[PDB]
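[job 0417] fold request received: endothiapepsin
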Amino acid sequence: STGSATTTPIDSLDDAYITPVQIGTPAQTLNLDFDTGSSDLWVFSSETTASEVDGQTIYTPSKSTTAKLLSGATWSISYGDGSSSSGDVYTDTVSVGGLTVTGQAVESAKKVSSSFTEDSTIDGLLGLAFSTLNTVSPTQQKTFFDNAKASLDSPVFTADLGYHAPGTYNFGFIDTTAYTGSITYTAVSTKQGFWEWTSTGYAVGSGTFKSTSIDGIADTGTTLLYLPATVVSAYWAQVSGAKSSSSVGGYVFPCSATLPSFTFGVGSARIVIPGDYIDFGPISTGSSSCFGGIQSSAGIGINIFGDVALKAAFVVFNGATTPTLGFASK
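[job 0417] inference complete; emitting structure tokens
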């Protein structure tokens, strides 16, 4: 089998991407944030504290004839950005772009933190990291991809995120029309449960390429590119008027400035992030100070190749017995 679904930016900055997911019988369609940095499929629901729902579409398991309580099961997650949610668990039928999993754990939120409530466009998350990170207790549950894997034509999914435009998640096949050149594959460590890999270096604009190993994660659920402070400083030093602002919480720059591209290494291959992808707009309405899309990972404890980086590529998440990642230009 295969599946293919369009993913759409939630706002004009590409702060996140939402993908429609059918849950239950009859189908309830929720728009979920596909997150290769986590491993829980959780939804706003009829069980979510009423004061914590503000515009989201909810899953109502009592209206699904295929929903079954996973008795005794609870879940609770905290994300790198400080947000969190928790609740209980049902199993139900979940379809993405034509691909159906029966018996998928659907984690129903009883509580969500303020940032989730405040984002009316995201109805939940669909985790696509390794199932070892899944928070369901007492019995850890499998991701949608893990459940689908054996049925897929090939045990892969691909992320093709758009810049200020829709893109595509495919399951079970590689669309050879969706990228240019060849796909370069690189090794993955699953030891932390992430799609963790080592970039071979970077360049800033037309500058020479610096060969240096940068361990990080391919994370569709993180908006920006977070890299070591050395790398980030080298980038922003090429932007007139850029500075790191403690009060804002990262590098800002005047919008009158021209952003250089940023190149990252995948083996001997190179992915070029155009300068415009690094502009995240005014820090506040009407401000002339713009927020940067490349920021320091210092204090996160890991480097994160988030959407800013991934949307410059066609990315293969290869779930073969030994997982790997593939990157192509597009």
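[job 0417] notes: The CA atoms of residues 58 and 274 lie 37 Å apart. DSSP finds four helices and 24 strands in the chain.
[job 0417] exit 0
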